[PDB]
From Swiss-Prot, chain A:
Name of the protein in question: Pre-mRNA-splicing factor SNT309
Role description: Involved in pre-mRNA splicing by stabilizing the NTC (or PRP19-associated complex). As a component of the NTC complex, associates to the spliceosome to mediate conformational rearrangement or to stabilize the structure of the spliceosome after U4 snRNA dissociation, which leads to spliceosome maturation.
Cell location: Nucleus
Coiled coil residues, start to end: none
Organism: Saccharomyces cerevisiae (strain ATCC 204508 / S288c) (Baker's yeast)
Anything else known: Present with 721 molecules/cell in log phase SD medium.
Subunit organization: Belongs to the NTC complex (or PRP19-associated complex), composed of at least CEF1, CLF1, ISY1, NTC20, SNT309, SYF1, SYF2, and PRP19.
Gene name, Swiss-Prot/TrEMBL: SNT309
UniProtKB/Swiss-Prot annotation, chain B:
Family: Belongs to the CEF1 family.
Domain of life: Eukaryota
Organism classification: Eukaryota, Fungi, Dikarya, Ascomycota, Saccharomycotina
Subcellular location per the Swiss-Prot or TrEMBL entry: Cytoplasm; Nucleus
Protein function: Involved in pre-mRNA splicing and cell cycle control. Required for the binding of the NTC complex (or PRP19-associated complex) components to the spliceosome to mediate conformational rearrangement or to stabilize the structure of the spliceosome after U4 snRNA dissociation, which leads to spliceosome maturation. Its absence leads to an arrest of the cell cycle, possibly due to the inefficient splicing of TUB1.
Disulfide-bonded cysteines: none
Subunit structure as annotated in this protein's UniProt entry: Belongs to the NTC complex (or PRP19-associated complex), composed of at least CEF1, CLF1, ISY1, NTC20, SNT309, SYF1, SYF2, and PRP19.
The protein, known as: Pre-mRNA-splicing factor CEF1
Span within the parent record: 492 to 539 of 590
Record organism: Saccharomyces cerevisiae (strain ATCC 204508 / S288c) (Baker's yeast)
Length: 58, 48
């Protein structure tokens, strides 16, 4: 019965190690998403500016 | 029939004495086994 408790705890340690590295990968992705999403926002604003600018010139 | 009587009476006493002590420890040991089967199934989904 004691052996089975040593066997069990080992599995749940790996559950945490996987849990941490899985959340750690997603954590890095998050920053990337927010980096570019801003850059795309910057692009679209500039896009709309030309769109009306070119009209108001003509 | 003497043996069957003598032996199986001893067996039933040895069994029920063990069972009383060991059915509790079986449940202890068997409910722990079920924890491996869930500790494994989560392990794979996290690895995946």
């Amino acid at each position: 019965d004691s052996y089975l408790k040593h066997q069990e705890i080992v599995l749940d340690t790996l559950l945490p190690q996987t849990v941490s590295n899985q959340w750690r990968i997603n954590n890095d992705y998050i920053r990337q998403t927010c980096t570019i999403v801003e850059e795309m926002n910057i692009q679209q604003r500039k896009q709309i500016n030309d769109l009306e600018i070119y009209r108001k010139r003509l | 029939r003497t043996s069957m009587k003598i032996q199986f009476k001893t067996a039933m006493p040895p069994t029920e004495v063990l069972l009383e002590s060991i059915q509790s420890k079986v449940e202890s040991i068997e409910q722990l086994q079920r924890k491996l089967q869930h500790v494994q199934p989560l392990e794979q989904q996290n690895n995946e």
